[PDB]
Symmetry: C3
């Protein structure tokens, strides 16, 4: 039987701990007014390929390295340059304490304020029913792009997430942003400390979904940003024929900090100087295994003063590697 022993010894020679997964997305975005997605035009057809190496350093720690490449269909000015999107180490300090260090993905609150790249440290204390997440670091994506280390506002975040049943989670968050340069309406302007606090609710009774979120900066006037959505579906990308539909409403005031929202609304701190207010309806359908088509139509877009904005619409296909 030692023959199979040496065969599996050879097994753990030429394979190793690294598991390679990833995805590839082909997306089309557009609007009826020029400049929403690509300057001087009203349509952006682009694609992205991501390859993620997940390696186990030891039994109690693992690290992740993701190589990401974006391109636009026909854009030949520069090569589809690869960028290390995620590079972090995940320590597991037992059954209740976990930590992340490096360039990971952070979600401030329910994701309305920020869900993207974040260089720093994160500590998770989890009862498995009530969870606490505390982060310290720097934002990288969205309205926080283009800032050097001495201009990028540091984020000190503490968030609580509890469950009120099966699949239903409520939560809150409190974050402190230092003085730094943020991008409003394409202009990088400096701002003082902000104490952004908010709450979110999510309910998944049966296959019905009902979610909402409200965040506000404590000291900055006119900063209340909230969202509220309903939906029906059972969307699983790995299972064929599982669809989903949802409709949601966004209301972001003039000074509301929306750096890079987890949602797909087209107006945030970078795009607007007078807020955003309107609906968006999204649809998902897994056409094949590990292949998913998505569509979205955002309408009734308005400014805070009653002015009118541009409707938008997107449609994309996502494919996964591993399994």
């Amino acid at each position: 039987l030692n023959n199979l022993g040496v065969r599996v010894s050879r097994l753990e020679d030429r394979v190793g701990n690294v598991k390679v997964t990833g995805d590839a997305r082909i997306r089309y975005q557009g609007s009826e007014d020029k400049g929403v997605y690509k300057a001087n035009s009203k349509s952006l057809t682009d694609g992205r390929a991501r390859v993620q190496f997940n390696a186990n350093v030891n039994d109690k720690t693992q690290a992740v390295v993701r190589v990401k490449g974006n391109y636009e269909f026909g854009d030949s000015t520069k090569g589809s340059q690869a960028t290390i999107d995620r590079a972090y180490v995940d320590h597991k300090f037992g059954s209740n304490v976990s930590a992340k260090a490096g360039r990971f993905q952070q979600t401030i609150g329910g994701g309305l304020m920020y869900d993207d790249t974040f260089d720093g440290a994160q500590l998770n204390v989890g009862n498995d029913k009530v969870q606490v997440q505390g982060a310290y670091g720097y934002m990288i994506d969205g309205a926080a792009d283009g800032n050097s280390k001495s201009d990028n506002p540091s984020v000190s975040y503490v968030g609580l997430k509890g469950k009120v049943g099966k699949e239903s989670s409520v939560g809150g968050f409190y974050s402190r942003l230092s003085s730094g340069n943020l991008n409003h309406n394409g202009v990088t302007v400096n701002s003082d400390k902000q104490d952004v606090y908010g709450f979110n609710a999510d309910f998944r009774k049966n296959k019905l979904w009902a979610g909402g979120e409200w965040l506000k900066a404590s000291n900055v006037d006119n900063s209340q940003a909230w969202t509220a959505g309903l939906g029906y579906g059972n969307y699983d990308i790995a299972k064929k024929g599982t669809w989903d539909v949802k409709g949601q409403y966004f209301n972001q005031k003039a000074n509301a900090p929306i750096v890079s929202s987890t949602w797909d609304q087209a107006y945030d701190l970078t795009n607007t100087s007078n807020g955003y207010k309107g609906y968006m309806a999204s649809v998902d359908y897994a056409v094949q295994d590990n292949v998913g088509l998505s569509a979205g139509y955002g309408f009734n877009s308005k400014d805070q003063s009653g002015n009118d904005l541009s409707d938008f619409y997107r449609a994309e296909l996502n494919y996964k590697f591993g399994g």
Copy 2:
């Protein structure tokens, strides 16, 4: 006993997923006149390291991601920047119909006009003897590099490839390029729509190869470009000692669209302002398994008006992974 079976199953988990392959190359190019390969010099000794990830999305769809890096031997100005060279998804809608979407490699016709990166979509029909390939998108590499999306000419291509004889292949193609910016002799000029069309033949039998191709723009004077060549050998990089020799002739006129040809000629639309006409003799030899050595000598290079261009010569070593 069962634990070993569970370990074998865990191995079985990570085998049908992402498969990592690739290659490396150490190449040297030179010419008898400066500026053909590198600005203000007559030689360029560089390399390349490509790593590709063939991942099966599911039993009827796979995706390919390739990371490449080009560095000159001694050029320390910039780093060996890694680029996503290929990023596409390939679908099989049955036994014959297939499709590709994303940044994939397109070969317009036989490869004399373009065989390189393509941004768009491709549809393949046909079972085993007649194959129809319809591509729609944008060229990226070659004479179409440096253009933006709004300046890049859009290619609508349909090509037919028939199998004749035991393994001979004949074919033709018709492609339409929208108005856009293209690189003529180092300057980006805006050309109108073109309707290019051509034919090719490839008769190979008993270690003897004879190939030919001819393409032409419909509404452009002196735009035809053709190649014709012979060869003898059984080259196969995965088998040691499999040599190969070949010799071929190119003649592409001043307006002939040669964006990035599949052959190793040093002159195309980017380098020549009045055409190209000359011979090239090439040799290949697999010195080891999965290792190959290639050499090439392009001579008799002349302009369409009799002006004499410069000879060129290349020597490269390609190592194939997996």
Copy 3:
């Protein structure tokens, strides 16, 4: 069992040759004076993610492709670009002669002058006792960065290394550098040919180590450089609890070619106007398997004329994969 044997054979069929390894480092560097590590600041905290593919081309040859990405915590101006750091092919013409071609790592002598990226060819000839390594190429990193081929000085190196006793090694080297540009104190200066010859010794016994290196440019005045260090420890990142400590003295003159030293001194030909002379103490400890915490404190930093320089201090975590 026979069916399981056939299954193991089938799995062995689908194994390929590419083995994915790598590492992830989170580092902090600082100095008592600004400009040593980062411009107009006295602290530089950053991170690195490297993923290495070891492909086995055939029985007597392999190739290596390394994708490396360096980022700074908070620096969002320029993305964490992925660069091909190593790309080379290794040939084995028997049990004695080996060759390398491409972009690999070269260790000129003991590593004080250079242990970093190299573009060219290398040839190793020798048995288990004596090794002779001859390399022709270009330096890419260190003080030779930022140069094109026409300015990058070609390096012709030949180094002999003989093992004395067990786990201890002595050796020497002779290297010839052509005329080219080098980054002296932030200014690219064109220098003529150099003939740098040197010796090194590395005595290891049980858990104690005594190392020394001395290199000199033959035709350049005030170009001598040397280091001498003593260490105690049994460091091995793959094993938990294996500590290590060492203390070493660097004395390198104004014209001594120190492009990219394998040590951790911050003053090498690129931020020195009058050389470097001072001590550095380093402490390593593998806190977990494949995880290692390192710290370093360089003090008594002075010029060759007696004018003092700035202290420096570093602290980093290294995570390794694959093995």
